[PDB]
Amino acid sequence: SMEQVAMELRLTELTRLLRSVLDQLQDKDPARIFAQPVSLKEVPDYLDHIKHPMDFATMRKRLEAQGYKNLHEFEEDFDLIIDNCMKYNARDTVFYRAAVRLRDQGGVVLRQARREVDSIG
Incomplete structure (x- = not known):
């Protein structure tokens, strides 16, 4: 139908905007701490601690x-990255501190993304 197509065009445009948001959030992780899944070869107990890795x-x-x-x-998944790290790693670690900084800096990007998503519909 034409409606399904219009819906698909909206999803495609949301995907465009989220790709830009993702790029901006990931720039706030210059150490690449959150770039890839936590390795189960290197942290074999990880899934005992963290039930939904991200x-x-x-x-x-x-x-x-x-x-x-x-x-x-999308924000649920971003929040998992941060929240998983702040539970697994202690306060005094480069990992925990990296998560706090990503949370704080990402807040600004996510604030305007919400306005854009609402604004453009």
């Missing part, structure tokens, strides 16, 4: 399959 490559795969229907879903 990282920027896994988000990018979902994104390019147009798997985020709305900004809320």
